[PDB]
């Protein structure tokens, strides 16, 4: 229909995107002011109306997309499903889930990432990096779990505040891994009772920082490459061979054209 064709290009406009962006920025600002409890009841009830106004503009925007693209088409995008769920969960009377409350209205500012393409591409790159840093994250999860059981068994009886149980131990080890007070605060006290506790903790620190760093560098590097490669496909429309693939074959392609040149010289010299 003509209604769904005109809707679509209204939705695809820069000023429509800019209207939605200023509505996200407005809802963000009013939720930030709402943290001020020194405000008068008049001001508090005023900002809650600005919140409802912002929320209804999103219900309108998301419904206009569902109509113009279809249910099959709108839900075909991960960023549209996120944009939907953000607004869809704001209209709910206590769903059957083990949550305390859905008072995280400020998670609406997260829509700024999806609405702004530059940030949507940046986040997108980091999301695609995660699968190819799955084995390292798993190795790190094993290393902690073994360290959490060891620490609870070794020190939970003498230092129950920090190694009282397995949950407590996972927390203290996360702290020791972030080098936060690990020595003056944890290991030095533990060492008075257990004089060789450094045998356990220095290797835990060495191992977890090498892995966390390998996990982070792995994400930052792949995401930076994925982003540039997506920009080339978005500009030229042609599929972009990943740089690692180009590098792994660079040797093969140079020695193929070395032999091709020498065999052309073979036919040329003898004529």
């Amino acid at each position: 229909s003509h209604m769904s064709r005109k809707i679509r290009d209204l939705i695809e406009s820069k000023r429509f995107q800019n209207v939605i962006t200023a509505i996200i920025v407005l809802n963000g600002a009013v939720l930030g002011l709402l943290t001020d409890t020194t405000l008068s009841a008049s001001s508090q009830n005023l900002l809650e109306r600005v919140d409802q106004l912002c929320l209804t503009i999103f219900i309108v925007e998301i419904s206009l997309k569902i109509y113009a693209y279809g249910v099959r088409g709108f839900f075909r995008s991960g960023w549209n499903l996120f944009d939907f769920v953000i607004v869809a969960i704001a209209l709910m009377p206590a769903q059957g889930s083990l949550s305390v409350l859905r008072t995280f209205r400020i998670f609406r500012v997260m829509r700024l990432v999806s609405v702004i393409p530059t940030m949507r591409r940046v986040v997108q790159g980091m999301l695609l990096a995660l699968p190819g840093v799955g084995s390292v994250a798993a190795l790190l999860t094993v290393v902690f779990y073994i360290a959490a059981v060891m620490a609870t068994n070794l020190y939970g009886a003498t230092f129950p505040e920090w190694f009282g149980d397995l949950s407590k131990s996972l927390y203290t080890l996360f702290q020791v891994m972030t080098l936060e007070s690990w020595s003056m605060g944890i290991v030095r006290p533990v060492m008075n009772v257990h004089p060789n506790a450094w045998v356990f903790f220095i290797p835990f620190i060495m191992l977890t920082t090498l892995t966390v760093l390998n996990l982070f560098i792995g994400i930052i590097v792949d995401a930076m490459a994925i982003t540039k490669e997506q920009e080339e496909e978005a500009k030229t429309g042609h599929h972009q061979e990943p740089i690692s693939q180009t590098l792994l074959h660079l040797g093969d392609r140079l020695d193929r054209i070395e032999k091709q040149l020498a065999q052309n010289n073979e036919l040329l010299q003898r004529q």
Copy 2:
């Protein structure tokens, strides 16, 4: 005129640059001594004259450039505008701005960066890197802002010193992000009152350190490439294709010359 031609090459000399450099180093040293309040009034009034002497030599230097290059030409360089504003703001009787005082005379040592070309190129590289780390810095700004609102709402009532308001929360979160006392100092105390506060803080730490690192690596990498690419254009005078562009097309250029070689072999074999 001949006056503007001789001026220009005096200004473009190595010993003129070296004179200005020793004047910046002299003003820097006298401002550093001026921090000593144990000095006698004779010594204090002596150093303030050395400061005025240094400042007038800059008024002379900057005026000689304005004449020899012109207003259109001198203000065409960003480094010359900075060199101008540094001296121009030192001759001002309380401008209409919300500043406390312009007692930051030591910001004159910043001219050492502009006067010394090696450092002017190094800083220049970092300035050009910033635009292409704009999306990440924006993502980080959103992540804090959401975390600042969440922390003020969750903990500002029980721990007002650290999450009393939104400003206070931005500060504590910056501290938690720099891993500074985050656990023994902030989260462990918060956890006595709110037993699951780690659900909020460990992901905040994980997320903000991955982004800050991605923001820093993005700057350091692009700046290092931009600097080397500018050095090639400064040496050869020819435009330098950015390394990312060379890498993204390396595959295409190798398979083009593979086909070109094989098609030349096609015409050669059949003759």
Copy 3:
């Protein structure tokens, strides 16, 4: 024999790997629950039987591999020797070694790395990186040892808790290197007695962080390359030229084909 041929492909199946994986995950979980001392004697003796059950399934699995591959063949793999020693040391009545006890049953979860190929490849990459970060690790070991002797001689008499002996000094320096309370906790106190101790500690910090970082970046970079290069050999079966070798010769190979093209043009123009 036909028994050793059928065994081998049972062992090489995905569901056999998945059975062993769920047995490792089960033994891991029961060892984690065993850390709970609030449990009843009935529950404690129940989990120890689940532990023995898991351990016997590994004795069966490892014996089935020893038979189907042979002793010469099974012990030809480093990952199989590790898988063997993990189970072989669990059946031992106090071997002649200077250990306290072999109560580290949770080191069985380490088999998840070997049993899961994705993680076995990830760890494998880090193990192969170590030899080519041997010189840096040695430089770091020399730097500490000299710093440990210097600190014990300078400060062990005045601050015996931290520099009492050489062992104590190695520990405090490891702490200072991880920037843990180095100033408010160690150097500031030391400086009251020895006003220029910063001359010793700031360079120690500068030097050890540059080396530890060079040691870590060296591992993370080589491991990431080794892993990708092993994946290419595993996919194509052909030997993969290391990227550093490709890069060091890239110049030579381009100027060889430049000359080969120009010499073919030499024979072509004159015909």
Copy 4:
């Protein structure tokens, strides 16, 4: 002469290097034991003789090199001059210098770096990296110096322990830059008196960590490349074009051979 020819190849042997290495390791160990003040006077005077024995073996070794290579030839190597000065300063009766004492005999273990080629190459790479991280280190030195003057002027009157003078301020800022207690320990206390001190400190932290990281990554990256490039020249004897030079011209060399191939096809098609 024949004496200088036989000496030279004794000195160039692997077992001569191994003898010197075990003498360095022996002197290192005896200096480490000498830190133990609980030792008996018999043991203390025994180890000082082992120290003199080690020192004389170095006087013999260094004199054998001076004779076999000459003074012009021996002092032509930076590693030989270091090896000389290490031993030459151990035979000195209080030279005219502003030092406290030359009780740093453990700086002899530093000879292990020079004597062992693998480490001598590793250190060598880091030394050659320094010049090309000179501009960044200078930028960092300017940033601190300006921050040291600003902090002393702003806070030295209210917080003299930390910003009492310019020296004191350089130290506190180095601490704030290493994120050591910067907030709970320095900025939070300072903020009670000066409520907007975070305006000064958060940017100081942001700026100094980006630069220190750029300074460190710059060293680690160039040193890793310099080392691999020196290994290629040591293996092949041919000069190695630096990877940055190869990369900056890779585009030019590919489009030169693209045109050379197409112009050969031009002459081939028309024949």
